[PDB]
Nucleic acid binder design. Structure first.
Ligand SMILES: [Zn+2]
Ligand SMILES: [Zn+2]
Ligand SMILES: [Zn+2]
Ligand SMILES: [Zn+2]
Lengths: 234, 234, 234, 234
DNA sequence: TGAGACATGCCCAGACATGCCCGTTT
DNA sequence: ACGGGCATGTCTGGGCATGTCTCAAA
């Protein structure tokens, strides 16, 4: 009964931004990101890899926090949590509170929090600089409830806020992305990307023919990306 | 679940990288390598020769370590081990623990590790310079479970990470290859290479809507470039 | 798992059997019965009237009990209950425990049981003779979960067992009907009845080899008899 | 590996024998009995209902024991048990030892035994007379390994022996059925019934034509049952 | 000795299933 | 109070996956 956490995309001072691995679309992928909608479509309880990129490595003692909130204005004040059924569904990982939606894996330094005032749920981990001969970091998340579970998110879309903060809890950078947990991310991704391209499709669009869906896949990606760089100028 | 070791290729100061033989003489039925897929196909517990290349002789006490990790994101955090059935088998050489999938053959200096923190398994041997007259060092491996063993890999593909490290365990170099342990390497290699070919020789055409004049020309010469590379056969 | 109560129809000494109304006047959208399937389609928590027929008046202290069991063999041993979500709801009348799926409506004599040994739920009411001028007694039920509730019936079909018993619980009679609790009884009833029709509107012939004149005799007759039933209603 | 428990059918003084439910072969079925083969096809850990018939009630304290043995003479002396993988999993059931293949569902009076001399496993339950209106009693079993699990049954066919015995453990009756635990009961059942069919078919046969695939399969099952009863006369 | 021919657990694109929203209707 | 569209978790037919058996042949 306090307030909603900030979601303003703060690039930061270290050039903090997130990156996602490219996936297919056929019903087989337990996870697939949409650059066009900035939406991660994933299946229930399946590890989702998320990359962290930085210009200059932050100072030791920096951490990364993850939190979910309802993307719809009227529901934004409601604490996002697991439904009654899955709340009872005991998972092997006893390190993460059974009521939490977002979990981190492969990191024993992960700390799960329940704000003493806002009652919001979140998870935190230290910030590891890229590996010797690498270029980014990666944290593996898992979502323990479907977006449709009654008594839970009940068909309401959520947003995952990833904040880069220091030992105090000061803001050093913030990124975010919408998430949809569902049984068929491939199918569901297509449908939304289509309704997106079901409007604003008129004007001066030059047609181009491509051979193979694989090649077509690449060209579409690289092109829907350039339709964002220009969109950002708004 | 446990933290995932990096798999990013890194040649390092010594230009470290792997090489494989072109199996097609006698023992080319028990073990075969696919350059197109960068995947080794081999039978259970059969010798697998791997070549180590290095530009300059590494420092005294350099070691070579081999570790397997699941290739798919939803399984990356799970430790790769032998299934309960083969674990209680009597194929152990005495030097290698029964739970390890990967063994080194023909080297009594091989050491086996059960990471006390990540619980990951690995085998390590001291680095040895190439034999006089050659520019590579050969290391022989054996994989103790089929990729299909239930209770074990359970049909999940794996990636083998080979790292070059100093006497203290610091990374000097890294490379990797995919491995499928099966009863019919030849047949399975043919199948997978054919499925990869079909995905490249896809004649179905799809149209793309560009949103710019010059932007269109970018994809133009780019797509025609590819459409000309396909003339390699045509 | 728990022992499965019998579901075999048994009229007993009193010629006990159930009867349902032909919904098609006003409230025929919230609850409809299919004679062809012997299945009741009704909305969550909406009144379901059932008729009790008996040839001679049962003895003093006769009771009527209702219990649900899963219809499929792989689920028969699992107790039918309300899902966690609706269980914590505030729809309880005070008389019925929150975990019971089946409630009796309009009768403060209704009693609710949680079998201490089989853990099965059931509701019981005293037997009451038909109203003057009628030959049946009406009992009203309400089903507190959709057949689709996860954590509960989870899309598994159920069978409702109605038993007539003496003051001590001995079986005097038994009958039953299938129940699907859904949001659209009409639509779902149409769908299922159509799917049943197609399974009979199948005119594919097959030939059977029978050994022995008397056996052929038996089969021929059993077959020519089923033919009548087929053209019996066109 | 010494002796072998008898598998000879014996109705005894109470006319003891087994009955089974009638099922189709669609992919939807998790359990299906074949009369022509007297073989039960069921999926891993799924409920298998077995009916028990008797001509006259047995004495007080009578029990029913189930035990599995390998059908092929060259494996009969080997005890049937769970493979290393499934054994290594303490299933929710806290009454049955983890190494027992056969379990009984819904019966707290069930007792599991490890014979001190033969080392054979068996599960025993008290004989319960049918309820009023019923002609049989049913017991619900669960088989905890696939017939193909390596390290266990390893593709070897097994037979289940059901014996009726008095409070002192003396043989009152015996019957049996072959069991195949697999991922696709319907498919495998169809396959084996087809192999039997295209074999013993020869001689004088009357022809009957039937309309409808299901009616035909029902008639064919009835006819195959009678034909099995023929080959068991001489 | 190796390539068909089985044997047998799993996968998946395309329905099907099923609670809700919504504007028209008795 | 009713069909028609959506929204979405689940099902399945045909095929794929994959260890094992086999018989004729370098
Ligand atoms: Zn949930
Ligand atoms: Zn194995
Ligand atoms: Zn419910
Ligand atoms: Zn097993």
């Amino acid at each position: 009964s306090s307030s909603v956490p900030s979601q303003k995309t703060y690039q930061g001072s270290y050039g903090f931004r997130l990156g996602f691995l490219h996936s297919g679309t056929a019903k087989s992928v337990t996870c697939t990101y949409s650059p066009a909608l900035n939406k991660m479509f994933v299946q229930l309880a399946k590890t989702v890899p998320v990359q962290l990129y930085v210009d200059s490595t932050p100072p030791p003692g920096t951490r990364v926090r993850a939190m979910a909130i309802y993307k719809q204005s009227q529901h934004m004040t409601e604490v996002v949590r697991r439904c009654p059924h899955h709340e009872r569904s005991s998972d092997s990982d006893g390190l993460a509170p059974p009521q939490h939606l977002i979990r981190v894996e492969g990191n024993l330094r992960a700390e799960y929090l329940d704000d003493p005032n806002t009652f919001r749920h979140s998870v935190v981990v230290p910030y590891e600089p890229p590996e010797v001969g690498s270029d980014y970091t990666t944290i593996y998340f898992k979502f323990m409830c479907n977006s449709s579970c009654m008594g839970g998110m009940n068909r309401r879309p959520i947003l995952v806020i990833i904040t880069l903060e220091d030992s105090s809890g000061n803001l050093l950078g913030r990124d975010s992305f919408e998430v949809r947990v569902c049984a068929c991310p491939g199918r569901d991704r297509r449908t939304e990307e289509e309704n997106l391209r079901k409007k604003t499709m008129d004007g001066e669009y030059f047609t181009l023919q491509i051979r193979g869906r694989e090649r077509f896949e690449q060209f579409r990606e690289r092109n829907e990306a350039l339709e964002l760089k220009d969109a950002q100028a708004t």
